[PDB]
Symmetry: C4
Subunit: 321 residues, 4 copies
């Protein structure tokens, strides 16, 4: 009735009553990267513009204190040439911080405080440039968007494979570039009650993906059927074909995590299957076919299935009779 | 007749009928890095040039609306000095965005809209500089080219080792810099039919690499012979010496993945062995030899083999008689 | 009486009598990033300012040797225009290295040594800019601060689960962004004496986290109870409920390590439980609850426990009677 | 007589007769980062200087073809102002590519080819800046220098632990910052002969590190004794106390690999123990001690050992009698 993970991978958690809000300010960079894109553009533009405005007010105060803003000229040279307005000081601060340097307004050697302001503005401008440009590149380069081209099967099935019952699903990579060291973790999530009376409201029990070697590591080029053999040690060992209705406390989440080959940042796609999205007694259709010396996958047939005859009984009363 | 992976690691897949083309636009950065090099240089040059052209048209419209392009001069100062052509506006836009700042054309404090255009151009120029330079460095620094100096054996062998039959091959690192945490995943890929009637067209079954500890983790300095012991749990357990002809549905792919020590980006080399590239009854020649206090590998003898006597029978009828 | 790891993850080690101090200078970059923030800002500002000062002294010596500082002018052009003070040379060095380029002081083609000084200053400025800006971004982007939003239970418990005794604790993620490929390593740290007489003063024995598949890999969205089953192979197999006093040589440290999804840098949080922070005969309260179609965790109830009846005997004399 | 790995981690391999030298040019970036530091500085300086020289020759040819180098002036404006020498063209090319922009030499709107040269120079300058600065930061930031502060024991021992014989050594971290997800791989390297006659000249057999959970993953804060239990499945199972002489074909290499917490790049330290650097019948001294509420390690006592009584027989004739 309320799913843990959405079909696109969004987690439906609320995080209520976080009391220790002070530790959120101990990692400002994670919160800065973790923002939305309008807030990221706003903080980018605001950081640069307020740095320019602060140093513009500094240059304007220097030109005031030297008496350069007053047009009563004698022969003494200003600290900065041709500054006679706050707009002039703002243009000069932009020219210094962006390192444009038009030269209509340049620092002269008259004011020793102006050289200190120039040094401080250059240092803070280099620091702001580094921390902001690196942050915006890290934001536009993070690999959680690569999960958009990692498709899963819309429905999972439970079918007879090699005399056992297996929970099978299909995961496909949509582009040419591989995902390096891809691993699959499937978790049965439901409310469990311990025999001693302990009730775990959202218990996540790992179901081992049948691989052949035991380790969970796939090579994803063609869309391959990831399946878990319902053994005696599996929490689906008492799952019934009539138990796959809606409003059933059972949800199998799948977490595929790897390294994107192009960027190099570790990505993680995830999906979820409720009890009504699990089709008992069906199996996937083969979509890989050889044509003209290459292999071809028909991604339109990705989630198509066929009703094959399986017994309508649990894996336990299949293992015994 | 049509191989899954090429000998150089290219995958022969087609990806037909990708219907959800809308999610390809949800990760624009992966597609941007994933381009070819002519398209990458074209989009780099085009992004910078069109940003300069757009802001040049903006500066030209400002100089038009102020009346600076008209040479009927009075005494009022322009927004930008010495702009009297679209070529002048283009040179000024290049000077602002690249932050050259020659100063023949500089922003004056007359036009308040010109200061806003300067601020917007500086912000968009910083953003474009970050996203483009970081992308081109990430493109020229990705580690999928490191696989060019990770050579594999041209032929794999099947030979008697320690009383068993073992599928052996040779992988060598061609340069001094190591590959950190290198792991080997070998997969037998063929068409399989389940006993319940399910036909998997391209089934990839992991064969465990014999390592001594079970885990697949190698230390690649000298070219070492990676071998898999054909046990009762191995899908090659019924492989015959006469089954190693061409047009035989059997292909063993090898995936070596690690971290490049110099760059730090996870790389993955891969190769493939068809049924005719597997030499029954042969073994590799030793190429490591000590000279003058160091070890030396003769990389010219990399794929040389020698016909040693092995039985001409399957691993099953070797295990029993 | 003296803990190995603090509750926040700080290690209480001293590193006395490090004799080979020469190898600390073989990785200058690790020491540079490893500094505190005042030292980092000081070395940043000092590197830039001393580079500007060194090249300013170079430009001043060039202007001296050409005779440009002497105001006895004829008609010969200077190497750099309008330099007549060390303050002028300093402003020119700042304009060259920061690439501002006002143009009141520009390099002329008269002095061939000035062109060489300009080339050397540009090369060293580009190198210093790269190595300093990348270092400060790597410093502000390192993921050891992400551990501030990875909370652990303040107390751990030992409770009856599924007929066994289990050492349980609770770890929660405080923000939306996941931590990819999170693994948990728990270690019992105490002084051990081998039966042959060998005394290990700080022995760290790995206790396996009960996961279902054996591998230590969690999916941290909701705060989940990490527990280790006290089996016959566990070093807590002889732990008593009366042995959980202070001044007891026993400390269980927990190390959660993963990849931050936003930044991509591997992070590691760690915590510790002394013998008095382990509550025998208690268990955690369920804090996950469904409201309005989503799940919600009450983080104020994070470390609340309830005294449930467990036997007051060791796991050995529970396993037998 | 000739060791595989040096004590500092350098591999003594030669890589003779690399025939496929063409694939070395397919990854130019790995070779560029893989250079020595004098070659890196030389190629950095040479790339920037030759780009400036090439575009300087371009600007000089433009000023020639327009007739600006000829001092026979009329009234027509040059393409670039105040260029009358190749030194002037070189200074202008430096000002354009470094984006200094003094403004004594600025692009005018007279020459349409000069605008194209300016665009091409800006694009190539941005590309060269990205690829060079990122490469030099990646070079100075690579984590193979972090192995200088990961010390190993100078001698390894073989001692009685828990009734078995164990090969023990000591690895210490020299600085405060941890190494995340540190794993240890020990390999016995020697010449082996298969019972079928196959001679492997440098065979590397993995010996499993005794950890408690089986997995090789350490938590390195204090210098801890890494030991491998000589079991029946271990290749040291027939190692004798008299077999630990020099000129004995046996060498145990140790590979510790992890993630540096500060930088985030995966590092790998490695060491080696010949047959004479393995002390039979000795064990390490405890160097961890509690003082004033903290723990302290005496790194001067790092490689000190004590001769404890062990039997002078192999692990096989210890297992039986
Ligand atoms: K400039
Ligand atoms: K200028």
């Amino acid at each position: 009735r309320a799913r843990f993970v959405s079909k696109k991978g969004n987690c439906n958690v609320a995080h209520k009553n976080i009391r220790e809000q002070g530790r959120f300010l101990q990692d400002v960079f994670t919160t800065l990267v973790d923002l939305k894109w309008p807030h990221t553009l706003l903080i980018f533009t605001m950081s640069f513009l307020c740095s320019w405005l602060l140093f513009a007010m500094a240059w304007w105060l220097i030109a005031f204190a030297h008496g350069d803003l007053a047009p009563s000229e004698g022969t003494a040279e200003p600290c900065v040439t041709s500054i006679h307005s706050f707009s002039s000081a703002f243009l000069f601060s932009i020219e210094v911080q962006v390192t444009i340097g038009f030269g209509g307004r340049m620092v002269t050697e008259e004011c020793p405080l102006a050289i200190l302001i120039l040094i401080v503005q250059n240092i803070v401008g280099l620091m702001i440039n580094a921390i902001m440009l690196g942050s915006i590149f890290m934001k536009t380069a993070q690999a959680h968007r690569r999960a958009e081209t990692l498709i899963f099967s819309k429905h999972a099935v439970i079918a007879l494979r090699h005399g056992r019952l297996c929970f099978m699903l299909r995961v496909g990579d949509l582009r040419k570039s591989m995902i390096i060291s891809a691993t699959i973790h499937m978790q049965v999530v439901r409310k469990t009650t311990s025999p001693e009376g302990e009730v775990v409201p959202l218990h996540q029990v790992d179901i081992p993906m049948e691989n052949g070697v035991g380790g969970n590591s796939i090579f994803l080029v063609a869309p391959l059927i990831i399946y878990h053999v319902i053994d005696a040690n599996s929490p689906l060992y008492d799952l019934a074909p009539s138990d796959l209705h809606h409003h059933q406390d059972l949800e199998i989440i799948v977490i595929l995590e790897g390294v994107v080959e192009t960027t190099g940042i570790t990505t993680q796609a995830r999906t979820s299957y409720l009890a009504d999205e699990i089709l008992w007694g069906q199996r996937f259709v083969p979509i890989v076919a050889e044509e003209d010396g290459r292999y071809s996958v028909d991604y339109s047939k990705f989630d198509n299935t066929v009703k094959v005859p399986t017994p309508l009984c649990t894996a336990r009363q299949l293992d015994e009779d």
